[PDB]
Design a protein around this ligand. Structure first.
Ligand SMILES: Cc1cn([C@H]2C[C@H](O)[C@@H](COP(=O)(O)OP(=O)(O)O)O2)c(=O)[nH]c1=O
Ligand SMILES: Cc1cn([C@H]2C[C@H](O)[C@@H](COP(=O)(O)OP(=O)(O)O)O2)c(=O)[nH]c1=O
Ligand SMILES: Cc1cn([C@H]2C[C@H](O)[C@@H](COP(=O)(O)OP(=O)(O)O)O2)c(=O)[nH]c1=O
Ligand SMILES: Cc1cn([C@H]2C[C@H](O)[C@@H](COP(=O)(O)OP(=O)(O)O)O2)c(=O)[nH]c1=O
Ligand SMILES: Cc1cn([C@H]2C[C@H](O)[C@@H](COP(=O)(O)OP(=O)(O)O)O2)c(=O)[nH]c1=O
Ligand SMILES: Cc1cn([C@H]2C[C@H](O)[C@@H](COP(=O)(O)OP(=O)(O)O)O2)c(=O)[nH]c1=O
Ligand SMILES: [Mg+2]
Ligand SMILES: [Mg+2]
Ligand SMILES: [Mg+2]
Ligand SMILES: [Mg+2]
Ligand SMILES: [Mg+2]
Ligand SMILES: [Mg+2]
Lengths: 133, 133, 133, 133, 133, 133
């Protein structure tokens, strides 16, 4: 078993896609271990979540977007959950995300991309600790 | 503008219907204002939630069912949210719930009936205070 | 606990609605106890199935339609399955069938109406004996 | 055999519900006979379309809403199309529209109510002549 | 931004898949700029649309199919819309189109393949001019 | 045309995914030629179906799983049906099955993987003979 950290991003709320995204993960038989709803995540939490991106040109725009509406943070559990949910998520770039994936079917922007999912064992631990101290 | 208290019940987790149910409410344009995930709700919160039923023959079975798996408690907001979400929910009795409703389409038991929704303005305020003190 | 006899009619095959219909019953938590596929049902079984209608003006057209493509016969089991699946099915007359029902959502004709369901305990036993001797 | 005039309203474009609505009518086996896309309908066509309501308190707000985004005008054909599509549409008042209907499932406002459908044979002929001269 | 030309082909109408196809594009957040419904496209227009195929053995059969029922022509707009909608469309050959794509999920023939989408900037301009002079 | 043998496995019944799986194949325009429902398949039939796996460590566990609940066996017909339905099915391994495929969207285990489909012309003939003597 692994646990991974998923964020449902503000664009999912704006576009009424929260259940659609959560449903795709639920239909794959992953179980919710923890879940929190944020009317607006504190900016500092967002900066910590994306600390590895602090020197990128998009960092401030990314943080602005992430505090622009609600987020749901979820810890999902399942065998090899980290890599599996990453494959369901799809690539960041709308020129690459595959039809059938969450981003491939539903996202059309590199930043407004509906969902975060941890990318490794090492980062899942870190991100779960940020959202679920 | 009103707020109402919804519970997604343990049978919805068992049957992987959590997103199906949340999605019916989301598509009606109701907004999540608060939400908590309970791996197992405390017995006392369940008994207070259903205090009106404490002397009924089904009370202990009801409470046992409600602590038999996870629940999600959600506060939804919208114009006339209380009556509107009650109408979406459908009748308790599976002989009465109408096709098109959540229970009419998906529930087949008087107790394992997937969803709670507050039945009035006063009970909404009460139930919101129980789950979101 | 009851068993009822359902027919998926030839129009459902023509319109690729077989799984749509079976899925509405499956989501209501009814269980398949028996099922047979008929590439073309024998005329005699159809005439016995609809024996009550043998002197009606529409009888020959009804029987011709019923042998015009495949049918699936299914026995479903569940608490009060007979009445519950009748309610899912919807009224025969397309001017009456309610949205949310199988016929209300999907059927637009009094004869090409997608689904048969037994109407009573005695007719269920009779119809089950016809299709599953 | 009848023809009826449907408008997909600006809120359906805003909420990405255009195909959801058209699909409910398509699944009922109604056929498109004519269809036009309006990036913004002319104010005069809207006022003629809703001429019966010209002296009502909500008329200006109604017309403003109707020119606030795109509309699709569609002529649908089928047996008793007028009454049948009215039944699919659902009651104007969100306190009354039934789950299973388009408005009952998806609309939450008396004005932003997603779909227009002709209410009678004579109004269908009138409305078809307005949108498809 | 780019604009691309999409055709919903006659097999989509025969199989009641119009809304399903349009919905997949709508859920990806592309916007309709122009749309026309054709009860039957003129053969000459089809020959112009597929002028590059005039020497292929399938040309006449392709033109016959394209005039065999209705078409909807749509101009969609979005960032990199041309390549993105091509990826949603899927490969022409049913041995290759990927599950998750429109053709991969829904088409089972090289010619009756539900949807056209422009393949380049150069051809989008040309095709938009054909369908929307 | 080819005919291929599909099994809907016991986990599909446990998880109420029978219609979901059958629907994906039906939407691709494959036709049912034969179908049988098994309340519980005889173990010997399962051992014959998987005879090529008799020396693998998972063989007994695989046979136990296959008799743990109902199966539906279906013969589907269509051009290149064998390879096409294999591509819809997706890879056995949940680390590899692609989003958009049946297993990629819905299965999370190497053994509880919802669906069997014949892998070649040679094995389809053999498997059809086992389930449909
Ligand atoms: C690469 C990239 C990322 N971002 C934002 C959106 C990404 O979800 C977030 C983190 O990037 P990254 O970790 O590369 O992507 P993913 O979300 O697929 O794991 O940064 C941009 O805004 N612009 C960019 O060019
Ligand atoms: C009336 C009734 C309720 N219950 C349980 C299931 C109900 O969801 C719960 C509360 O009853 P109630 O408030 O009547 O129903 P609803 O949930 O529709 O508002 O009690 C039974 O188990 N048996 C019964 O006969
Ligand atoms: C009443 C009626 C039925 N039929 C056909 C279609 C019905 O499914 C079938 C049996 O009629 P009935 O038992 O009245 O309907 P249901 O199928 O709703 O139980 O007869 C007609 O063709 N015309 C009619 O006027
Ligand atoms: C009755 C009513 C209608 N309207 C608007 C929305 C309605 O779609 C439109 C026409 O009214 P009406 O013809 O009564 O409704 P319907 O659309 O159900 O046929 O006028 C209001 O804004 N407020 C109102 O109180
Ligand atoms: C290649 C090919 C195309 N066609 C038809 C169907 C195609 O949609 C149309 C144009 O071909 P093409 O431009 O290759 O495909 P696409 O539609 O994927 O851009 O020609 C055939 O009928 N047979 C064939 O072998
Ligand atoms: C390879 C493998 C198969 N199996 C079971 C599940 C497979 O569906 C079945 C037959 O294997 P195989 O023919 O390799 O897979 P497929 O079902 O994709 O054609 O054996 C295991 O239980 N464990 C394993 O490691
Ligand atoms: Mg990342
Ligand atoms: Mg109550
Ligand atoms: Mg009857
Ligand atoms: Mg009106
Ligand atoms: Mg091309
Ligand atoms: Mg195999």
């Amino acid at each position: 078993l692994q646990r991974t950290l998923v964020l449902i991003k503000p664009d999912a709320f704006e576009r009424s896609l929260v259940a659609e995204i959560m449903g795709r993960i639920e239909k794959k038989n992953f179980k919710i271990v923890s879940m929190k709803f944020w009317s607006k995540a504190p900016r500092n939490l967002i900066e910590q979540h994306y600390k590895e991106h602090s020197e990128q040109s998009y960092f401030n725009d990314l943080c602005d977007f992430m505090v622009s509406g609600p987020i749901i943070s979820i810890v999902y559990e399942g065998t090899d959950a980290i890599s599996k949910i990453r494959r369901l998520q799809g690539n960041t770039n709308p020129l690459a995300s595959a039809p059938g994936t969450i981003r491939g079917d539903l996202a059309n922007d590199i930043r407004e991309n509906l969902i975060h999912a941890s990318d490794s064992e090492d980062s899942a631990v870190d991100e779960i600790s940020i959202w679920f101290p």
